Amino acid sequence: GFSQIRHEIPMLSLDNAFSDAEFNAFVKRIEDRLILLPKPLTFCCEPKLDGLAVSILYVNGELTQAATRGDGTTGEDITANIRTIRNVPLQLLTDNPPARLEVRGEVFMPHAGFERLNKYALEHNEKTFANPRNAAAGSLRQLDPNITSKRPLVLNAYGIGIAEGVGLPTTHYARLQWLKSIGIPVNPEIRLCNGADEVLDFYQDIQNKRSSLGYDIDGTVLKINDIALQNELGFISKAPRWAIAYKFPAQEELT
Amino acid sequence: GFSQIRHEIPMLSLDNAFSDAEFNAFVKRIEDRLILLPKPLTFCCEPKLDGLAVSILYVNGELTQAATRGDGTTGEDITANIRTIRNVPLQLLTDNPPARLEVRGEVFMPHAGFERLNKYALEHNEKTFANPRNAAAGSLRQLDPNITSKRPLVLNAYGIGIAEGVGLPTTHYARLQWLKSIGIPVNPEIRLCNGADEVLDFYQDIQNKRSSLGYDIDGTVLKINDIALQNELGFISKAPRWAIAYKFPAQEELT
Numbered sequence: 256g257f258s259q260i261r262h263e264i265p266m267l268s269l270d271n272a273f274s275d276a277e278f279n280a281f282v283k284r285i286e287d288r289l290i291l292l293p294k295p296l297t298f299c300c301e302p303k304l305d306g307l308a309v310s311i312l313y314v315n316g317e318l319t320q321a322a323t324r325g326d327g328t329t330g331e332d333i334t335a336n337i338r339t340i341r342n343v344p345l346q347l348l349t350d351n352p353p354a355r356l357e358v359r360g361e362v363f364m365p366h367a368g369f370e371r372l373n374k375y376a377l378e379h380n381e382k383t384f385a386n387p388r389n390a391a392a393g394s395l396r397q398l399d400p401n402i403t404s405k406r407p408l409v410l411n412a413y414g415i416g417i418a419e420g421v422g423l424p425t426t427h428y429a430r431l432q433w434l435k436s437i438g439i440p441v442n443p444e445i446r447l448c449n450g451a452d453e454v455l456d457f458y459q460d461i462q463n464k465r466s467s468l469g470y471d472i473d474g475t476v477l478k479i480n481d482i483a484l485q486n487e488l489g490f491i492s493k494a495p496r497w498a499i500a501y502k503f504p505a506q507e508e509l510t
Numbered sequence: 511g512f513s514q515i516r517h518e519i520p521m522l523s524l525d526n527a528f529s530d531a532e533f534n535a536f537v538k539r540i541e542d543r544l545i546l547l548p549k550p551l552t553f554c555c556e557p558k559l560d561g562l563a564v565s566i567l568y569v570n571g572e573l574t575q576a577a578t579r580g581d582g583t584t585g586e587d588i589t590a591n592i593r594t595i596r597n598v599p600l601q602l603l604t605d606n607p608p609a610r611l612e613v614r615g616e617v618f619m620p621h622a623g624f625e626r627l628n629k630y631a632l633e634h635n636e637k638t639f640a641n642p643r644n645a646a647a648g649s650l651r652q653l654d655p656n657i658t659s660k661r662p663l664v665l666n667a668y669g670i671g672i673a674e675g676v677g678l679p680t681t682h683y684a685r686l687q688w689l690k691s692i693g694i695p696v697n698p699e700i701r702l703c704n705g706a707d708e709v710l711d712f713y714q715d716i717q718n719k720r721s722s723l724g725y726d727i728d729g730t731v732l733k734i735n736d737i738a739l740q741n742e743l744g745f746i747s748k749a750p751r752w753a754i755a756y757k758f759p760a761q762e763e764l765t
């Protein structure tokens with residue numbers, strides 16, 4: 256199979272909200288927690304794309320390795336597969352590439368590609384992919400990078416992991432803009448919002464085009480723009496490093 | 511339904527190991543991480559019981575509230591249900607109860623009870639419980655605490671959450687012994703181990719009696735005994751507090 260890769264920096268998951276009610280609930284939880292509410296709190300609002308999350312490493316501007324999210328802590332080495340994705344640059348353009356930079360984002364299959372692939376499948380006696388999401392995951396997680404080569408995949412960056420030879424801007428949005436400039440792809444629907452009301456609008460606007468843009472949008476990820484606040488706000492951890500459950504082999508049936 | 515309760519302190523999950531290989535892997539990961547290996551590292555080795563995890567709160571010795579684990583961050587108020595569990599004390603015996611103490615452990619159904627309950631079910635035209643685990647969960651999560659009253663449940667403590675009017679000992683094992691003395695039930699199979707080899711023995715010994723003791727044992731949870739090291743070792747977190755995914759309502763079918 257694929258070589259396993261332990262992410263130097265974790266690939267955390269997200270809590271979900273399925274209503275404005277739960278969303279404000281989330282906001283309030285933050286306000287209280289924050290030492291002093293800046294008023295009115297700015298969120299970097301970006302669309303959540305339907306696909307597979309991946310981590311790409313750049314060493315002095317050169318794409319050197321990539322992996323799948325895995326369990327969030329260990330993924331699979333899909334470097335070669337990643338190089339086949341056109342919109343993924345092999346070289347960051349800056350003249351001053353950080354020592355090491357880890358770009359994170361969604362790999363996905365737009366409607367046109369998805370539709371074409373499935374047309375081919377059906378007409379050639381092969382189960383079609385249920386959705387662009389699943390199609391993406393399979394197209395990408397290929398032992399033979401040539402197959403991945405022929406699948407229409409696209410990368411939309413949303414974050415950074417390791418980062419050394421740099422002093423990243425203080426705001427997430429500023430960071431995404433930097434990633435753009437150095438040649439990395441990031442969704443253009445990302446906007447800045449002040450206060451729930453404003454965010455909720457973003458939510459509505461995006462939802463009213465979750466499929467109209469040419470690709471699938473799962474929902475919207477809302478993040479506090481100010482990096483300092485992020486550090487302050489913390490991480491809703493779970494599972495200790497000092498312990499572990501060593502489970503017994505499954506119970507067998509009678510007979 | 512049940513009133514929701516947000517755990518003041520989280521109810522973390524555990525990583526698993528299904529082989530000595532993965533176990534040592536876990537140990538090594540710790541040794542490296544630790545600033546200085548004390549040699550040879552002591553683990554509090556306790557059996558992992560098959561059932562439901564619960565959190566019981568004592569205010570000045572009095573059981574005042576209890577809840578289910580939920581998603582680890584929010585559970586259900588099952589206080590009344592808990593009071594029906596015999597081996598759960600309503601009053602900690604010490605003359606000096608902490609301001610507030612939160613005891614955590616597994617609620618479960620031993621073989622005898624499980625078997626009896628199911629005998630009744632079958633003979634009265636009712637689906638039997640597949641296992642003591644499931645039977646426990648259902649017997650406990652009852653809107654009517656009287657039903658829970660008639661199900662044979664048992665509590666085996668394994669940890670502490672909130673703790674105020676106290677200065678808990680420096681070792682987990684010391685802490686469990688304290689919980690015993692103040693009247694709380696804890697599994698007697700808990701032993702102390704030095705170095706993998708020793709732990710691995712515990713693993714074998716317990717596995718060779720995972721059902722022979724009169725109740726079901728899932729596996730064995732291994733923890734570093736020294737609380738200081740625990741703090742040092744940290745928490746393998748996942749999910750930020752500064753962000754959240756606001757998902758769109760599910761996709762609908764054609765027609």
Ligand SMILES: CC(C)(CNC(=O)c1ccc(Oc2ccccc2)cc1)c1ccc2c(N)nc(N)nc2n1
Nearest residue numbers: 264265266267268269301302303304413414476753
């Ligand atoms: C926000 C984050 C959860 C990424 N963030 C991280 O993975 C992450 C990881 C370690 C961090 O810091 C730590 C460093 C060391 C230890 C622990 C935490 C901080 C953020 C996320 C996840 C999924 C997303 C998605 N599908 N679409 C969009 N648009 N954005 C998304 N954003």
Ligand SMILES: CC(C)(CNC(=O)c1ccc(Oc2ccccc2)cc1)c1ccc2c(N)nc(N)nc2n1
Nearest residue numbers: 498519520521522523524556557558559668669731
């Ligand atoms: C070790 C722990 C994961 C409990 N520990 C915690 O829930 C926990 C929670 C917050 C902690 O500290 C924090 C406080 C605030 C924020 C974050 C962490 C530390 C431990 C656990 C889980 C399941 C067990 C089981 N089925 N059987 C046995 N025998 N032991 C078990 N032990």
